[PDB]
Amino acid sequence: IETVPVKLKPGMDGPKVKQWPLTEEKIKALVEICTEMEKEGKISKIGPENPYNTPVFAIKKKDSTKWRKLVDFRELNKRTQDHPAGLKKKKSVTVLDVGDAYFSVPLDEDFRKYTAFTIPSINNETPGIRYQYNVLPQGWKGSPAIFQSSMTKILEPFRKQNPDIVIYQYVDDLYVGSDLEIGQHRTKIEELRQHLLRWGELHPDKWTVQPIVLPEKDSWTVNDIQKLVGKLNWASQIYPGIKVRQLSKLLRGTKALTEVIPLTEEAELELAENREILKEPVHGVYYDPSKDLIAEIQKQGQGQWTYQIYQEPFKNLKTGKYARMRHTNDVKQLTEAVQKITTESIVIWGKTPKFKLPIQKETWETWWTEYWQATWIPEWEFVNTPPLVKLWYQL
Amino acid sequence: PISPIETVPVKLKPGMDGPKVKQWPLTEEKIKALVEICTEMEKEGKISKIGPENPYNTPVFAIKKKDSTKWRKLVDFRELNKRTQDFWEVQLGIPHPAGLKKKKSVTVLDVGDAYFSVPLDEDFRKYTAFTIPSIRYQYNVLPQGWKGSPAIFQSSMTKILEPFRKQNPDIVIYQYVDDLYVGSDLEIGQHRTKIEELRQHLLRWGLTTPDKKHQKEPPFLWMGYELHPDKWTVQPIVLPEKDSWTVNDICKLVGKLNWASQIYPGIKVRQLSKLLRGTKALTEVIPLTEEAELELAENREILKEPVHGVYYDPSKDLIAEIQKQGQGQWTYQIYQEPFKNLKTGKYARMRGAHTNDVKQLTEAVQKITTESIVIWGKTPKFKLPIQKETWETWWTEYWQATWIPEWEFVNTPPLVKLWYQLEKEPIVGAETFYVDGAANRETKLGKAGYVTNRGRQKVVTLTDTTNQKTELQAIYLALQDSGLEVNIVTDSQYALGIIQAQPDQSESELVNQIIEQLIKKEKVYLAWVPAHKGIGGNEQVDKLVSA
DNA sequence: GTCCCTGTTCGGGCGCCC
DNA sequence: GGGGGGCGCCCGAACAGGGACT
Ligand SMILES: Nc1ccn([C@H]2C[C@H](O)[C@@H](COP(=O)(O)OP(=O)(O)OP(=O)(O)O)O2)c(=O)n1
Ligand SMILES: [Mg+2]
Ligand SMILES: [Mg+2]
Incomplete structure (x- = not known):
């Protein structure tokens, strides 16, 4: 298949991040994964005259006999040339790893050198072994982009068949929300995976915010109030409505920290007021x-x-x-x-x-x-x- | 012989051109050595005579080798190196004897004239022009002084060994530049056959293995160690003994000890290390401190004793x-x-400070x-x-x-x-100090002081100070004038962040003095309050220290 | 903004290996 | 005497950020 040309941001050079030390486990996995990728033409051996580098490691899902390779492309992404509101409301969302999809698209020959990486050895028995990508690499932001067109084509029928289901992708990830029972949701997920096979869990409605809240007590010491005023003084940056004037007034004089202070009528009120201001949500925050x-x-x-x-x-x-x-x-x-x-x-x-x-x-x-x-x-x-x-x- | 491996394409940085540099004068002994080396390499196709159609040139010299009966041709490519492209180094670290596993049979090999066996890119050869004066050449192989040479050699060596490694997954080859440690779980006879196989393999790729450098029996010499079958040791370390020490001598002593600490327990070098804190040149003499002087003997004693490491x-x-x-x-x-x-x-x-x-x-x-x-x-x-x-x-x-x-x-x-x-909670029946500092940025003058719930107030005037310092001074003074239990209120995030982290040592004389106090005390409680909000009696003390 | 303090990084010298 | 790359160690310059103040 013909390749999409790809640029760096202008005035920007490829990544040059040093590989960190890996454990024996991760290295054995990587070497294994890499030789197969080399057989399948997915990656190629390169020399040191390629001056770029991006770190690489490996993760083992849960209890499994399968490692996933993982390239730290953060730098490359920064240097690479340049949303469903409904999804946060589904009762269940599953995340699928559709990164494999990417190895089927080739990669711009003039870009491949920026995807160089290096496998280390235990105890530096040998120099690093350097590879570069020949196809679309998982984890690179350029990858969902190039492949977006073919991604819509895969899904359009499943979406037509299931209009209540919202499918979102972020790089190697497919986010899938439904309003179904579990089992109905799960059976539906197995449907998309099987539909995906022919081409080649979250609960965002139990996400909670943690409000600022104020101590409630029957006697207050100078210390209690000193803390309270300081906390409110800072909070008043987030909510202009907060006030610590009346409460301050009680800290007139120069008193022992463990002295108890009976709250005046106003101060008792200002405190009640503030409790409420904290309940009223942050005005004017535009993503x-x-x-x-x-x-x-x-x-x-x-x-x-x-x-x-x-x-x-x-x-x-x-x-x-x-x-x-x-x-x-x-x-x-x-x-x-x-x-x-x-x-x-x-x-x-x-x-x-x-x-x-x-x-x-x-x-x-x-x-x-x-x-x-x-x-x-x-x-x-x-x-x-x-x-x-x-x-x-x-x- | 020259490896039939493919060259590795290199290029100058853009807008750049090769090095033009006069050949500094050489000693006779060396010129004799160099033509001896050059006439040999030139026969072997490793260097080619050039004509006037080559503008460039770069100095060359020779140091004796470690055995010290043969010479190493070097080229000061410092300039060419500035203008050569970048490489990603492939050598990630240094193998360590403690990471080796017990092997039934072991061998150590060197390659004979390693770099000069690996061909250099054709298009890049002209830039290597050099001159032997008493005749001027360019390199066809990797030179020793170029910054491309290590990564290209190391990478090539790795390609050359790949087939063998694939074929012999269970023979272990630690490859360090051209140094090879080869270990197996085979009986000595079968091991030796495998070594011949390895050697022929290197020969077909142009890398010879001179018997002179082929170790067969222990203790093996490898990477600055001696490897016996059940133990390893470092090769003897020798510290200097001058009665007058320079920076350079110090740095040379520090390094040798650091190197030693990998197998000699107890080595210390703080006392030595600080000596070179201000010193601005290698030349500078320095007097040992009684502290440092004392360290060296301790170390010097540590080395006298016999030590070894074991394998993994x-x-x-x-x-x-x-x-x-x-x-x-x-x-x-x-x-x-x-x-x-x-x-x-x-x-x-x-x-950290x-x-x-x-x-x-x-x-x-x-x-x-x-x-x-x-x-x-x-x-x-x-x-x-x-x-x-x-x-x-x-x-x-x-x-x-x-x-x-x-x-x-x-x-x-x-x-x-x-x-x-x-203390996590304010201390009952402990005097409450409200401390504060202010400083004038212009005049550099300050005041630290406190006010207590028991009617005490004190203000101290300081000179050549900072806000942060006055803030720390205020806390110090309250610790000084308080009993074994004190409550302290500050409006200084700075000070509170330091003290709350429970330091026991500081670069700062002041914080050290504070730390001293904190340890003497039975109970301390640090409260923060925001400044300039009229909070009493942070208010009253803020008034006192600002004038 | 400035000044102060503290953190990171990067470039020196040395050590060790080839 | 004059070179190279790797790792290590220390050190001091040049930053980058946050607080406190004019
Ligand atoms: N001070 C040094 C020592 C070595 N090397 C390089 C170039 C050498 O070719 C290689 C291996 O070093 P050896 O000491 O084994 O030297 P050679 O292999 O060149 O020669 P010999 O046949 O004497 O081993 O590492 C270098 O650049 N500078
Ligand atoms: Mg050699
Ligand atoms: Mg103040």
Whole structure:
């Protein structure tokens, strides 16, 4: 088949990211997967005169005897030349991995060199083994694009036959929502997979926001109120309606932290007012597809994680909470969090967020691939957060 | 002979042209050596004489080789290298004897004149023009001084070995440039037959294997080690002994010890390492500190004793044990059977202006894990001098995600501990201090001070300071003037973030003094409040320190 | 905006291997 | 004396970001 020419963004050069060390398990898998891909003409061996590189690793689904290869194409995607509102409302949504579909389309010869990657060896027994792609690579943003036309053709009948079903794709992923019973949904999914075979679970209606909420108690110490005023002072950035004037007034003087303060009539009111302001939703937040979704996550402790998505500060598109059983592995939990938040954002806006991760770069890089199960990878950066904001979203 | 392998196409960077560079003057002894080498290569088709139709040129010299009875022709291609395209290096690291498995039969081979067996691209040959003066040539093979040569050689060597590896999946070939360690589970006779097969295979591809460099019996010399059948050792290390030390000599001593720490436990180099903190040139002499002087002897003593590593049994677990050396210095041993080290090492990086021993221990674990993954491709089990409870406290309290993989406590002091603990709730019957700082950006003058619920107030004037500093000074002063239990309220995110992280060491004299106080105290509680919102009595103290 | 502090990255010197 | 690539180690420059202040 003839190939679509593909460009880099102008003034931009191909990726040059160093491969990280892999475990024996992942390397054995990769070497296995790669030799087959080489037989099927899908990838070719290349030299070091190709100066590009993109990291590669591998993930093992659940309890299975099958590894999926996974190329970190985040950089390449950034450098590569350049949504169903109903889907977030289905009672059930299944995610299928239709990446295989891509290996059937060839890839622009003049582009192949940017898809170079390297298999490492245990103990550097040998130099890296370098490959490049000859077909459309999973994980590359160019892949759904080129293949979109053929993707519509596969589906148009299934859609005609099932007009109540919404099918969405994000790179290697097919998101499929229905309003059916389970079993009816599942049997319907097996239908699409069988329909897909001839060509060659989520519950977005139990997604919940985590509101800001204020302590309720019968006696207040100076400390209780000092915390309260500070938390409200910050919240008043997210809701201009909040006020901490009356409550401040009680902190007139210079008093012992454990002194109890009887709440005045006004202060009792301002407090009631504020409780209500927090219930009334964030006015004026318009999703902009020309800007990046930022995600912040705060570790709350004891398996509780809180998160917010916004493109501009204090202008949250969403704010959430993430609960987990209270041998807890913080790093495992955080990457399970990041995966679930990315999933939501793909569904709600069909785009991945930039994460600000509350962890040390090296801790995270040492371990996150042990817990990854997605076919995509969000951009991210690392932050040592003000322990101020942790108390703000505290439940 | 020259490999019949395909060349690897290379090119200059765009807009660039080959190197024109005068051949600096050589010693006679070397010119004699070079024509000896050149007349030989030229017969062998490895270099070609050029005419005037070649504009370019690049210097050339020769250093004796390691045996020191033969010479190595080198070319200072520093300039050509600036103008040659980029390569992606394919050599990802360095094989380590501790990652080798026990083999029934072992061999070590070198290739004879390795680079000069691999053909260089035709179109790129002109740029290699050089001149032997007493006759001027270009290269037809890879030269030793070009930045293309290592990756091209390493990659070619890998292509050449692929067929053999495919055919002999169970013979293990550690390939380091042209060095080959070949191991098998065969009896010596059958192994030797396989080695002949390997050698003929390399010969058909143009790579000779001189018997001089063919090891057949142990101990094998390989990558700077000696490999005996059940143990390995590093080749003897020799530290300098000057009575006057320069930066260069120091750096040369640091390196040699770092290298040593892979199998000699206990090595430390902090005292040495700081010496070169300000020093701005290799030439600069430096006086040893009594501290550093003291280190060297400790190390110098460590080396005197005999040590070895063992090979890796994959059917047994990997264990790593960490010890604390004080000063942000850590040592580890990786083993499978006790008192039989696989290898050793040290961690000593200081990440952060402020930190404590639990963070540093977490950084050690991360480092050893990454390193274990490279060498054995799996994580070790840990044995750490930290109580399970200590870790849990830290993990609970800490606001970052943090984690150590499977591990077990080992009561080998000095144990790692948190040195103080902020109260989660305000302390009843503890004086409340409202601290604050202000500083003038222009004049650089400041004030730190507090106000207490018991009527006390104090203000201290500072010089050459910063807002952040005044804010830290205010906290210090309140710790200084308070009893063993104090409640402190600050409006400084900066200060609260530092202290709340429970550091026990800091680059900062001030934070060190603060840390000192915090440890002396029975109970401390740090509250934050937002500034300039008239909150009492952050309000009253803010008034005092601003003038 | 500026100044301050703290983090990352990248480029030096050395070590070791070929 | 004058070269190359890899990994390691330390160090100091140049950033990048956030808070606090004019
Ligand atoms: N200081 C060095 C040492 C080696 N090499 C390269 C070029 C060599 O060809 C190759 C392998 O090194 P050897 O010491 O084995 O040297 P040769 O294989 O060139 O020669 P010999 O026949 O003496 O082994 O690594 C280099 O560029 N610089
Ligand atoms: Mg050789
Ligand atoms: Mg102030």
